[PDB]
Design a protein around this ligand. Structure first.
Ligand code: CYZ
Ligand code: CYZ
Ligand code: CYZ
Ligand code: CYZ
Ligand code: GLU
Ligand code: GLU
Ligand code: GLU
Ligand code: GLU
Lengths: 270, 260, 260, 270
């Protein structure tokens, strides 16, 4: 009996092949997450089928309806068996599912449109109107928004730090809506907003987007926090311990570092 | 019921307070791990007594004896209830004890005396004139011993077959040996201890190259214990609300006794 | 008995003189390989007639039919007696024909139109904006096809799954395609032809990086023939006497019609 | 039936371990040639034993007796079965033994004691009293010699090029004798002669010696010719085709280049 692997279309984790039209099965997808699933299968023997979540969401719990959507909702209600996807370990998620030891470290960063070079001996330098989250909160001419129904939005919602509280107070009562439905939508808003918008996303996707063409976006300031991505399984399932030791073994062998290097920096340009 | 806590003397995590001669209980200890234990006890709701491991070892299994030592031996043999200390999460420990979610990122770092001729680990392996060592019975020696990569294989062959013995008994001994070798000996340890040492006096060592890999410290509980989920959820909450970051900043950067 | 020699029209090895319209026999050919054939015939003591391969292919086996073409096909099927031409010594060819000792060292090189951004082969593979090809039915293509190295595997996947067809029919076609690509196309070919091209007009291409591997050209003789030992000993004698070095200097460096 | 592999104690081809006293068998020796022998055995299965020649010579036919001494002598007479050692392909050697395809290209070079840097804006530049073989032959204050009973000595003896002829005419009649019994003896002569001696040796050994400490020797000019190293086998023996095919497979797979890189350039002491 094969298990269901639920994923989310996000680069470079789960991308779509340019020649996927006539391909059927797990061979249509490629990226970091498919390689991680292959290595997990190699360590502990099992057959898997890759599925993309229906709603295209990472997972969130409704305030009143009190149900989980996205991959978390898929795992809790039994529609899937394991989620090999960039799912962030959070306090609320751990109370409903089981998270393995993180296979990648990350943080909350800022994405802004890369500013024009400063002409004024004859050296060329770059200036940025945003240098950190504090000065981002202090100003008003540059708006900022996050990805809806994600770990970052919930972190900003429950944050008790004064600067993050101010940022959340702005975001929750901003017209027009500053949130986006997908990471690609947020990046597109950044690129088309002539520098009048800043995107708060995970540092891994931030670096990935910065490295590729048209290389017109850059990351400013340090990581707002330190989190990770875990492989999630439903509470009490028998697939938790095997994938835990699988992740540990992959970390010890150095396969994870090689995968990060070959999917993130090896394909860079600009 | 008071919960016994095993911990090791390793600055800045645990330090012997200056007035510990007139102090008793857990009031004679200070550091990052003391505050972490206090927060864990406050969240879970248990009373704890901080006891230092008898031997200054972290944990390993002797070949052809299969006996655990250090704090891991304290945990598996029932002599200790929880290990709130910089215990690196490894495969050989996950099969014996329960590790919580990581609370501190770290990696393998190279320390030398104050051009950086060595810089890279690969270039370090390409050189024989300068010597390098590691702490015995730790996650570093076991990582180098069982690493199947060519560079790490060469490094482990170097360290195992070396005279005089290049490993050090304690991390402080390793840093002293680096200091008093006139730049002929290098020490490999976790990046956190490296940063803490290089930010302190006499500020005569640096950190070169980069982290060889990435690991994390975790709160350790005996396999099947009842404190696993409470401490794991406590660690997640503490990281979520930023207590861990503030503790690290207080015990690592807040002093900075050097020009930087 | 006149010995039939199969050879290919590749400069500077074999050229069609300047007035081949008024010449008959072997007097209408000139080049390094013509001189080498003359020396081999003089040493062994046989009369030879130089015949050009009908199809401008060096030789390869075709999948699902296992039929040899080019000069190797001309040799395994009895149509030719010897192949005095720049035929790279390879594994697949050695299983069906007798190769003499190498008489000219060579390697696989990269050439782009006139610091070059391409640098080495690893950067050339990593950088996708520039396109790289290879002459079809040649040892370089067969080298990349069965190569198990990661960089060469990526390169072979690129060239195989490329639109339009990045391969070229002849070496001159590849050189012209690089020249007229405005710096968008890179040609992979043997070191000797690359140097000969880059030391000639219009002197607008340069060889970059290093050699991906080291190989050699050999005199090809049908398996189990009576000419293999005499030609191998002749090659050894010619190399010892410095005739091969003299011929290479005459046909490669003696002209130098460019600024260098 | 185990065949015997004959080698010559030459670095970095066949070297003695620092703990060979307590070791017995094919584990005492190490270097490039032992790895080549291991790979040849792996590709075509056979058991082998490593032996060092008693006379410590590569091979040379004696005048007025027409007998071969050294590795070629012990392979021709049948006392050995295969010579996996840096044996140069020569015309005289190929007429008595079957010699495989070359596994490494080499050339005759010149090694002199590295000269002191010139003091005289403030840049330091090195000057050498020898720049090629021509000005080496023309002068008379710097002596030069070659390994006795080797391929280079026979190349110089039978050479018809005018400069090489003059060099051999000097070498064959010169007191005291300029030839050396071993390559290490020639290197020691170069280092102890304070620069009044030059040594002619293979380019591979020359580069290896230059890259080791104390690196007081350097190579001048360029290679006088192009030659190779092959795996020797007695004439009309059953091992010729297997080892030829094996060395071809090793060359195509890229093992030879990696071995050369790991034994020659990896161990750099200057
Ligand atoms: N360099 S990286 O961000 O791709 C990265 C990050 C991490 C890795 C491995 C890599 Cl390659 N493994 C660790 C794991 C190893 C053991 C210690 C912590 C977890 C369990 N988690 S991590 O610290 O989140
Ligand atoms: N900045 S730091 O090294 O003190 C640090 C490091 C880490 C923190 C929190 C902090 Cl403050 N939390 C993560 C944990 C939180 C949740 C997400 C990953 C694990 C589970 N581990 S970590 O990535 O090792
Ligand atoms: N200088 S060159 O490229 O024209 C060149 C190249 C080579 C030459 C001779 C010359 Cl002149 N001889 C060798 C052969 C001679 C004997 C030693 C190795 C093979 C057998 N092959 S080679 O190393 O490919
Ligand atoms: N780079 S090197 O000198 O170590 C070197 C030299 C040579 C290699 C391989 C290497 Cl790695 N293979 C060739 C062989 C391959 C095929 C073509 C010529 C012989 C048969 N001989 S070589 O040209 O003498
Ligand atoms: N990676 C986050 C969502 C992306 C984001 O919030 O930027 C998660 O898995 O919840
Ligand atoms: N803190 C590490 C030991 C440090 C080291 O590896 O040197 C451990 O518990 O494994
Ligand atoms: N001369 C080569 C072909 C050149 C190439 O590989 O491009 C051969 O005979 O194999
Ligand atoms: N390398 C030569 C001998 C050494 C020399 O001539 O310098 C050979 O194998 O014959």
């Amino acid at each position: 009996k094969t298990v269901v692997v639920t994923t989310i279309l996000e680069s470079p984790y789960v991308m779509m092949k340019k020649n996927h039209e006539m391909l059927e099965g797990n061979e249509r997808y490629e990226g970091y997450c498919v390689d991680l699933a292959a290595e997990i299968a190699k360590h502990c023997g099992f057959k898997y089928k890759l599925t993309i979540v229906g709603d295209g969401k990472y997972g969130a719990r409704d305030a009143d309806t009190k149900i989980w959507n996205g991959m978390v909702g898929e795992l809790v209600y039994g529609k899937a068996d394991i989620a090999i996807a960039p799912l962030t370990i959070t306090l609320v998620r751990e109370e409903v599912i089981d998270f393995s030891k993180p296979f990648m470290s990350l943080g909350i960063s800022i994405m802004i449109k890369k500013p024009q070079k400063s002409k004024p001996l004859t050296v060329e330098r770059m200036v940025s109107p945003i240098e950190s989250a504090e000065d981002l909160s202090k100003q008003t001419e540059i708006a900022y928004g996050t990805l809806d129904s994600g770990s970052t939005k919930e972190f900003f919602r429950r944050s008790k730090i004064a600067v993050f509280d101010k940022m959340w107070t702005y975001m929750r009562s901003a017209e027009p809506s500053v949130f986006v439905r997908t990471t690609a939508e947020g990046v597109a808003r950044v690129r088309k907003s002539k520098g009048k918008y800043a995107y708060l996303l995970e540092s891994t996707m931030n670096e990935y987007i910065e490295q590729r063409k048209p290389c017109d976006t850059m990351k400013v300031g340090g990581n707002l926090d330190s989190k990770g991505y875990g492989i999630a399984t439903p509470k009490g399932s028998s697939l938790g311990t095997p994938v835990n030791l699988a992740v540990l073994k992959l970390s010890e062998q150095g396969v994870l570092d090689k995968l990060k290097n070959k999917w993130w920096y090896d394909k860079g340009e600009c």
